Symmetry: T
Subunit: 153 residues, 12 copies
């Protein structure tokens, strides 16, 4: 099964900036950890990784999850989580399972980070586990897609 | 007269997703309905259609309108209606007629859809008629322009 | 089909006061324009016009609509748009098409004009086109009704 | 005991519109149910019923309750509950017991129904029991009037 | 000159209810005091008195101040002061001077009395002087209409 | 009919403290008044009374109403009305009729008493009648239970 | 009887700045108009005029209305109307009648002018009549002090 | 390692009430699934399960995580998530890792569920995965405690 | 005189956790300091100490105070200060002196600590002095009681 | 040690006005009570008293404290507590102990008295004890200073 | 050019207190830095410096700028920026260019510093550059005064 | 010094639309004025200019400032100032000085312009001076870079 990992604005700077707040592990390193999670689990999962600082590129990518190629999305929308009704609508419209991940606990930071339009549109949200949250999302997504398959059969 | 029809984020997914909310007519089907409204009315209107999920492509397109080709805009900014001061400002600086259309009644949904920066910047707003709203906007734009050329 | 045109408080003062805000066409002149739109289109539409400054007369009239004479309402509730839950409720219980019209763009004036209880209760809202907005509403109501009789 | 039952706007449409929210029992049926309750408990109570969509008619009627004819009021102000400081003041100035009734639970619907200016002016408030709430009010009104008289 | 005195909902109950809050002087007594103010001043003023509990009657009356019969309005809108955008618009549209009077200080009571849509539409507001406020409004209106006349000449 | 009457925090201090606000009738007296009301109307109703200052004991007790012993609850949550989402959820999950009672009019006191999470979860709410409100609730509960059974 | 007229911050610039908003009549001219109002009425009133841009000077002056010399105060607190809980408390503590005057209608301007801590502390408020409001306050104060005298006797 | 699973008010009614909103799987069934997760993983984890409808019992239990017996807590505070500053403080004071779990997405329900005092106090939050969220929390906690151990050595 | 010292949720963890926020003196050490303040002053004061994490145990204890044993309460409600209308109400109905103490300055922390329902219900509040605040409260309670017995 | 006692606007009117709100003891009487508390305790405390209605005189005085004469401030800013960021800032920059006192419980009055910029800037706040609050502050300041000289 | 530099409350404590927030450069040093900037660019500018903790002295001084002596004002109102509608009005009534300066970024501190009534009244606002901001203001003031004169 | 000047959405329309609000000077003219300012003060500064209507292009460009090419950024984010937490975070993560400029005074326009997420992330903010503000920023940037180097 194909799982699309979408990483939003500023995430490409992971490990390179503000280690104290977001950690030393880079985005390329998180994605290799996700692939090793699959390999070791022998999961029937093909991951695709996509990062962008553009709202419109995120939406275009989500819409491309139309065709029977991608089954689920794992998304960290970054700061667009708090502001983008347009990505939230794209998630609602996608009609495939979407899981939201935040490295930090967005309940425990500035008041302006508390709202997540996107996260409200997603089936589930994971926050404050750093990079591990992404392996937690994989685990979850595999289970959700298998349970959807059982129900269809 | 040249009329530019701008369709904002997610609008291209019409008729393919969430039919009970946004209906079964696709974006291509709305646009051919608008064309038929023109043809069948022998209106002297040349339509151009543009869809995008990018706020900046919308601004670029509104600014591209400045050069005596395009005379009015009919815009559905989608979710950017509620969030984009930047598009509101582009509308303000465009210095020609802009009508906002919404498929749904944005007073009757989530609280976060009630604010419209863009609609506040347009001369007129139409909402809740589905696709017919775009034909309503055409009727308006043609009367507005007609009346503008007489007053000049 | 019978269409009822309800004009709320102050609307009768049109063209006699504050022309730079609400224009120079009077309420009688808008209504004869709507009639001409019907006649000149050979629409099978019988218009009835009603103006009042009384919230209760508006409710009475919406309820009087219940009996298979009137098929849709075109309403400009005036200032009651922003304050009258009671008219919103009458609209909800009326069980037929209601379109709200506003002469001005109520997203672009005082903050207290942004809320519309009534417009939230209507299928569609039109604002900011001046008098033309009522012709836009007629076009809509006729298409809505047409489409309703086919689906029955 | 002469007890005035005032029914506010839209209440005359009971049973005739939106049965799923407000029930199939009509206003006339509720008033027969109140008389049946007065009989089958031998309350020395004479009911007077008054329905209106006019705020001012409700205020006129409350003021009429000045003369030693009517001893208490049972009121369902409808949507005026949420908006009418004028009816709340009329209640306050009346100096007779008033009891507010709502068919629905106005803590469990839209946010705009939670405020009741009127309810706050009343001695007590009943909500969410449908037509029975009016009998519950009768029960309390007879009791309140008894207490006042024992004190006299 | 003709001055219209509009008294809003509940005002007809003055002196008869809640003396403690609104006083012992009745509405009919305030209006006789206003007429005696004119008579004694030898003011060229004809007063018309109108009370109603209907928003629509107030608006109808204000609109009737169209014809060159009434020059100014003195209004106590009562509780409609706080709620009626429709009366505020009627005042704005009237294009004759309108003065708002409150018996009580509506800054010193419930929070819901603080907003006055109507008072914001009026040229001036007088509050908290009881019945005297109405003679204060007369004095003011006479002066305003005389000053308007001088300016036109 | 087994009907559980739950009385929330501070309610056991009735009559013993602040008589001017909450009356001189004690909680024990209110419960005798409820039994007297069941007798003098031959309601086939058995009352169980429970008072506590613990939120969790109220939730434990509502959950106990799972087994086909207790058919309905009459609750005065006290100050937990304004604060306890946990009791409101217990009410929602109970799937038996619940009716909320307050001695005072909680629309007419401090701003912090106006919210009732619990009341919103209940089928109906009664306030401002003092001890009588509990009898009013009984009346409604017996009726609600009858309607449910006729439907069964 | 002695009536103290307190004029708050910026009022000394009347007639000299922003004529369009506050008028051409200067503060010294308003005070002469008030004195002519007394003279012509033959009112038993001695006026004292005091302007200051200092909150503390206003409060000190109000407290000086302790001794049986001043019977009433007519105050335009200016912008301190909206901000000074300290002047509002001084008014409450004074226990003599105080009337608030605004040249403009503070209901019809910026949202930040709508609150009047001071005006809520005063028995009455007059706003939007320009200079005339001060003669309206005099009229009112004379009537209030005479009515207080009758009641004491 | 000992992991304490705290389940808050109403959770004991899982599977028995409102299946549509919270599911058919009971609380006792979730806890057996967590134990099978451990057994199958061969994790060095001893689970203790505790449910209560009492705020004070939750706090007492958290404080009992003082002694070097329990290393981490997995908590679903239920409705106390939104209201209990006292449990949030107990979490802050505990100085052991605490993970918050919600069955539902509390961003996508009533406005009153959006605030989580407790979740802000926790290192991480998981929401909207139903029962699976608890196995996701276990996975996370095992990883967090192992990483803490490596760092101490 | 008997003085009851009530310490609310988490207070028992003092000096064992978060020393930089709440200090290094334990709850037992504060209480023996209060005892020494009494002894060393030969005050005629008998202290009783009570800590709990349960809102209902606090209410129970305030109500238990009603019987002419206990003359005043010194309370630190902890986090319940900000949330418990139920304890505020218990304080109001207790009908004797209650002083609230907080170790920290609750005006100078998170916004959610600024509201104190309980402190609004107490005669006096002390905050920000650490443990010394409890000795300050003792000094106050003894002067308050002294002055109360003279006035009786 | 030198302790400066600053009394803000209106405080000089104590005991001469509104006795039921602020009591009958004058400002001079409070200050001689504080002196007696010192003398009778043989505290090594030299008090200086300052009252003013001027925000700037308060700031001037706090800044004048900078020079090794004055060691701590006891302040009642009066109404400036709720409005003066400028005094809050002066307190922050003063770099020595400041205790705020209020005669009344400012959590239990108008909503506009609940905010205290100044009290948020002080180490400790005392409110609701009347004049005794100033003796409480003295006790605190002496213990705070004592403890500060030992730690140096 | 005579340019008045007004420094508001607490500003005279620069360098003497809280160096970590406001720097180690004193107010006197900032004013020498401004003179050095006028020299090393030959601005025909004469500076006058005025610091005060009194709102009324700031208003008195702004009013003094009436007479054709002072052509512009450079002001750092301190905390009065956030609270003084009176100083904002004095700025508005002055009819000479005024420029506001803050040492710190008042968008990046407490929520209560974000509002500036004064800044809103000024032609421009500078923040977050420390002492340099005053030179930046000088630069703009000389330019603004030039533009006005070219126009003259 | 390589200094990047980023100009946000709508800024390329300077001088071409709404001259009354934003002036007649074009973006190209502002950038020549900045070069002229660098010359006539011999700042060893090389400017790079970048304008875009795309939020993501602004973030891409700020990230490009990672490599030791560009030492500081001067940014006018346009309307993204009020809405873009994403650009504010890019500013924060950049770890080079950034200075925000606005042509207009964003404290003196609509309420929706007062918030600046970006400005809050920046070292300083300049507003209301028109084109000159960019030179003021240059002045500060060269200084800030000097201070950092002296420290190096
Ligand atoms: C290199 C930057 C990573 C960021 C992650 C996030 C950012 S910025 C923020 O813009 C957002 O508020 C929270 C966030 O999505 C997270 O914690 O994962
Ligand atoms: C295929 C999606 C169409 C949408 C239309 C709209 C969306 S999403 C929403 O994002 C917006 O709130 C309302 C809206 O502009 C409309 O009703 O036309
Ligand atoms: C002659 C007055 C006409 C009015 C129209 C309207 C008014 S007043 C207002 O009271 C309302 O806010 C807007 C409005 O409904 C519209 O623009 O059509
Ligand atoms: C036929 C309509 C009945 C209505 C009743 C009510 C309405 S409308 C509403 O306008 C109001 O909010 C609640 C209400 O008073 C009730 O539940 O009884
Ligand atoms: C007999 C009732 C007189 C009233 C006057 C007024 C009422 S009710 C109120 O409804 C309104 O809030 C204030 C008011 O207009 C006034 O003080 O004059
Ligand atoms: C002896 C105390 C009785 C109380 C009742 C109530 C209290 S306290 C309050 O805590 C609550 O706000 C209202 C209330 O439920 C009622 O009016 O019945
Ligand atoms: C020369 C300035 C006169 C002013 C008067 C007033 C000002 S400023 C304002 O500071 C205030 O908002 C209203 C005001 O008190 C009034 O209209 O009288
Ligand atoms: C049987 C009830 C389970 C509940 C779970 C929850 C409840 S009630 C709620 O009280 C809370 O808002 C969310 C919640 O913690 C969750 O989704 O896990
Ligand atoms: C060991 C924990 C002590 C606490 C004290 C307090 C807590 S937690 C808090 O929960 C409360 O907000 C403030 C408080 O009451 C105080 O400062 O005394
Ligand atoms: C003689 C006036 C005394 C005052 C004291 C106070 C006042 S006015 C008030 O202006 C302030 O809100 C509370 C206060 O500081 C206190 O209770 O000590
Ligand atoms: C020695 C104190 C200097 C201060 C400056 C300022 C203060 S206090 C504050 O009171 C204000 O909020 C911001 C301010 O104007 C600035 O950053 O320049
Ligand atoms: C040609 C448009 C220029 C604009 C500038 C600005 C705009 S639009 C606005 O979108 C923004 O609120 C303020 C602003 O950044 C400024 O004053 O420089």
């Amino acid at each position: 099964m194909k799982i699309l990992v979408i990483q939003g604005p500023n995430l490409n700077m992971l490990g390179h900036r503000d280690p104290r707040l977001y950690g030393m592990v880079t985005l390329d390193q998180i994605h290799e950890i996700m692939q090793t999670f699959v390999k070791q689990g022998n999961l029937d999962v093909e991951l695709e990784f996509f990062q962008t600082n553009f709202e419109g590129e995120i939406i275009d990518k989500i819409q491309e999850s139309v065709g029977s190629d991608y089954e689920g999305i794992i998304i960290n929308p970054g700061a667009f989580s708090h502001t983008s009704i347009a990505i939230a609508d794209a998630i609602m419209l996608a009609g495939k399972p979407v899981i939201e991940v935040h490295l930090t606990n967005i309940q425990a930071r500035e008041e302006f980070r508390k709202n997540s339009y996107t996260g409200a549109a997603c089936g589930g949200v994971i926050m404050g586990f750093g990079p591990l949250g992404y392996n937690m999302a994989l685990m979850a997504m595999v289970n959700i897609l298998a349970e959807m398959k059982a129900f269809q059969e």
